[PDB]
Design a protein around this ligand. Structure first.
Ligand SMILES: Nc1ncnc2c1ncn2[C@@H]1O[C@H](COP(=O)(O)OP(=O)(O)NP(=O)(O)O)[C@@H](O)[C@H]1O
Ligand SMILES: Nc1ncnc2c1ncn2[C@@H]1O[C@H](COP(=O)(O)OP(=O)(O)NP(=O)(O)O)[C@@H](O)[C@H]1O
Ligand SMILES: [Mg+2]
Ligand SMILES: [Mg+2]
Ligand code: NA
Ligand code: NA
Lengths: 333, 333
């Protein structure tokens, strides 16, 4: 009661939000790359410097940002992905909070450069000050968007303390990129670190062979044990791969990539199902190696549980679990 | 790009926020009760109806809310607990986002009734509409604050679906109240369900005996095996109780309450430390029963990681772990 109930300053309120969604450089990358995916992007180039604590440049060939919408794009609670409660209960895109851009820009130097197909001129935008004021200016840029985030946490001393080493932090970026490359085989992704190309995942065309990118990501060992899954029931569909438990090593058990409607996710439920399927098949229980994709009606899953979409809750919980269990158990036989 | 980048409506933006912090009735209770604690409250009465899906009434004898600050209290990003980045990096209260009240009021009928010691008159306030407009009016109320949340999720059909049974949901409230009663022995707390008193934890006076409330909460079995801990090193202090691993049952292992600066918390780090201490002491590894309290300089711990403060990150990670490990290991010998 000594201090008055007061509205938080624009920038500080955003940093608090940034703390719950922007953990480290890998997190900045996840969000910006997911924006590119939503923008219809087909080629995404990521350039990192000093593990991303120095620079994070993400360029995409997505639809781009309108000039008169550059500022809105950097505003809080501003999004083009949903406009009602209905749209929310049926999320069909990675983003929907309209919080990512303003959050990251409040703890770094974020520059947004974009051009839509209907524009001859390209534009650049960024927020500054205690109030996060936006300024828009000319710039040369092809159709699409380039995000440039510099000096992550340069203005949040405390959080900068938690940054690991260049190598470690970049390693996390690499793993996140790896996860996204597996969610969208149809998307070409290039990753560079300190001027050198670390990796490049070329797109897998219509009905093309996925195994190729699969092996390039998870390794050849995994590809040899990988058992393709195709299990469906109405609006529940399980696809992807599961390696034979009898032939899974601790090294392979590192590959436990799971997706819900194309969104990377680590859900205790799904994981429990897949494992039970391997415990009841094989003799003992152990860590399985997999890359499963669960497609489901967006009304049966709630993704508004974590500010970073790290968790989900299935309405019909038991059903979903039994579904994945059978699916996996079906292939192990 | 078809839909324009647009700012979300007041109410919908809050519901999205509510989804990340207000899981179920127990969550509403946690937040409101934590507000009472911050308000200097010494007696907190909680009344629940139909597992809290019908009504959640929390009355406290805290300092209360100023009349001209009732609206601010219900606004977004509005708080009296912090006003700068400095205040944040050194959190000394349960709340600091200024998001709890508006979030819950956007998914229920929340009525705030309060009076400060300097006011003769009491007031009542609540938000309504797509824009969350506040209205303030007369009301009779002693010094303090009463929160009344009705029809949780009445306007969010999807989330209402996830509510368990009356008994289950109330069971979660009971467990949360149990956790808070353990964090503040000096606070009298009364809990009722459907007009009947379920529990009442009376305050433990200055230096009084805690064991009494300890046994009333965790049970007598735990109290018999409980080993008091008192381990300090500078600004790191570990207090509380740990039962002998050799005499811990699966029933007792249900008691694994941990606190950081008086804030209930379940951290994998701390848990790992306590267990390692029991694995290296006893023969095998297993679930330990405990009620530990970790006090530490607010600059060594970051609590701005989860919108509901469900997680933390220690700056000097290894040190903290070794500290709790020794502390526990010290008592087991
Ligand atoms: N690379 C991009 N290309 C085109 N439009 C973009 C790009 N990145 C962002 N946008 C637009 O900017 C708006 C949002 O930025 P952002 O702040 O990330 O929120 P969001 O995507 O709406 N939801 P969330 O991620 O949950 O915060 C989006 O709604 C898009 O319309
Ligand atoms: N029971 C109460 N008694 C007195 N003041 C209260 C009470 N509950 C809330 N308030 C005041 O209302 C303001 C905030 O409500 P709330 O929306 O819960 O945010 P917060 O406590 O600031 N932070 P957070 O919980 O992280 O959102 C507080 O900052 C207090 O000043
Ligand atoms: Mg986004
Ligand atoms: Mg609060
Ligand atoms: Na935005
Ligand atoms: Na508030």
């Amino acid at each position: 009661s000594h201090m008055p109930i007061q509205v938080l300053p624009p920038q500080l309120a955003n940093q608090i939000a940034a703390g719950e969604v922007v953990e480290r450089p890998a997190s900045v990358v996840k969000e910006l790359v997911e924006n590119s995916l939503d923008a219809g992007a087909t080629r995404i180039d990521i350039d990192i410097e000093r593990g991303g604590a120095k620079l994070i440049r993400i360029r995409d060939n997505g639809c781009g940002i309108k000039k008169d919408e550059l500022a809105l794009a950097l505003a809080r609670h501003a999004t083009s992905k949903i406009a009602s409660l209905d749209d929310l209960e049926a999320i069909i895109s990675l983003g929907f909070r309209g919080e990512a851009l303003p959050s990251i820009s409040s703890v770094s130097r974020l520059t947004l450069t974009s051009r839509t197909a209907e524009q001859q001129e390209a534009w650049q935008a960024y927020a500054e000050g205690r109030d996060m004021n936006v300024t828009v200016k000319p710039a040369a840029h092809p159709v699409g968007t380039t995000l440039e985030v510099l000096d992550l946490f340069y203005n949040t001393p405390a959080r900068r303390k938690f940054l690991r080493t260049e190598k470690t932090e970049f390693n996390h970026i690499d793993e996140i990129i790896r996860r996204i490359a597996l969610a969208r085989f149809d998307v070409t992704i290039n990753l560079s670190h300190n001027g050198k190309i670390v990796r490049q995942y070329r797109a897998v065309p219509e009905g093309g062979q996925k195994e190729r990118r699969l092996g390039a990501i998870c390794g050849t060992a995994f590809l040899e044990q990988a058992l393709a899954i195709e299990w469906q029931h109405g609006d529940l569909t399980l696809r992807g791969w599961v390696a034979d438990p009898n032939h899974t090593t601790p090294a392979l058990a590192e590959i436990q990539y799971c997706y819900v409607n194309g969104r990377m996710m680590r859900d205790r439920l799904i994981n429990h199902a897949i494992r039970q399927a391997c415990e009841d098949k094989l003799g003992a229980d152990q860590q399985p190696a997999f890359v499963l994709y669960l497609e489901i009606d967006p009304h049966q899953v709630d993704v508004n549980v974590h500010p970073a979409k790290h968790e989900v809750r299935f309405h019909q919980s038991r059903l979903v679990h039994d579904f994945i269990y059978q699916g996996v158990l079906s292939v192990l036989q």
